[PDB]
C-alpha cells in the first residue's frame, strides 16, 4: 500500500534538528490568477478552519504563479470570504467561476504549518 513515518528511528534513517529564534516577520501573499479553461483546480485539503493548499494543478493558473505556493491559507478567494470555507465548499465555489476571471487570492505564507505526513517525495538531497 503506502508508508508514513518520521525521522529519529532505530533503523537506516536520517535525524537532525532545525530550530531557530525567529518570529518577527509577517508577510501576506496576494496575486491574481487567470482562471483557465478548467480553472485553477489546486489540490487543496481540509486543514483546520481554513483551506490549506496541498498541491497546484499544473494545468491551471496557480500552478503557473510562482507567488502562490501549495501550503498557504486563503482568506478571500474571488471576493468570496473563504476564510471559514470548508473543503467541500471551496470547491463548489471556485467551480461556479467562469474562464478568464480576475480574482484576488489572499493567502498567508506563515499562518498554518504544513503536515509533514503529506509530503513524501521532497526535492531529495542525497
XYZ file of C-alpha atoms in Angstrom, residues 9-92:
84
model
C 14.218 5.998 14.258
C 16.073 2.813 15.203
C 16.972 1.940 11.612
C 18.628 3.228 8.438
C 17.116 6.716 8.574
C 18.004 10.392 8.989
C 17.606 12.626 12.041
C 18.586 16.200 12.897
C 17.466 19.485 14.453
C 16.050 22.576 12.747
C 15.154 25.060 15.486
C 15.590 28.837 15.438
C 14.941 32.094 17.294
C 12.914 33.903 14.632
C 9.357 35.237 14.809
C 9.379 38.907 13.812
C 8.232 38.763 10.188
C 4.637 38.768 8.941
C 4.017 38.960 5.193
C 0.813 38.213 3.284
C 0.692 36.802 -0.244
C -1.806 38.099 -2.801
C -1.881 37.522 -6.560
C -4.412 37.450 -9.398
C -4.823 34.062 -11.078
C -6.125 33.810 -14.644
C -8.859 31.171 -14.470
C -8.047 28.677 -17.207
C -10.368 26.590 -19.366
C -10.519 24.142 -16.459
C -9.993 26.814 -13.821
C -7.422 26.653 -11.032
C -8.104 23.162 -9.718
C -5.478 23.454 -6.991
C -5.489 20.228 -4.976
C -6.236 21.861 -1.623
C -7.084 19.891 1.515
C -9.086 20.422 4.704
C -6.638 21.588 7.372
C -8.338 23.479 10.185
C -10.965 26.233 9.864
C -9.066 27.423 6.790
C -8.348 25.842 3.406
C -4.648 24.978 3.233
C -3.390 24.330 -0.297
C -1.636 20.980 -0.703
C -0.897 20.973 -4.435
C -1.424 23.131 -7.524
C -2.858 21.836 -10.799
C -0.032 22.178 -13.321
C -2.701 22.720 -15.975
C -4.030 25.710 -14.057
C -3.330 29.320 -13.113
C -1.984 28.930 -9.578
C 0.498 26.313 -10.783
C 1.747 28.970 -13.202
C 2.009 31.552 -10.422
C 5.344 31.453 -8.619
C 3.695 33.645 -5.995
C 1.115 31.198 -4.643
C 2.576 28.028 -3.134
C 0.989 24.718 -2.054
C 0.756 25.415 1.666
C -0.906 28.771 2.294
C -4.157 29.941 3.886
C -6.633 31.720 1.614
C -8.688 34.463 3.262
C -10.717 35.770 0.322
C -10.666 33.880 -2.978
C -12.669 35.726 -5.615
C -14.428 38.322 -3.473
C -15.582 35.237 -1.571
C -14.537 35.168 2.086
C -13.208 31.604 2.020
C -11.663 32.167 5.450
C -14.129 29.777 7.058
C -14.925 27.882 3.867
C -14.909 24.083 4.037
C -13.103 21.825 1.565
C -16.443 20.708 0.129
C -17.475 24.345 -0.291
C -14.227 25.906 -1.508
C -14.524 23.512 -4.450
C -18.205 24.128 -5.186
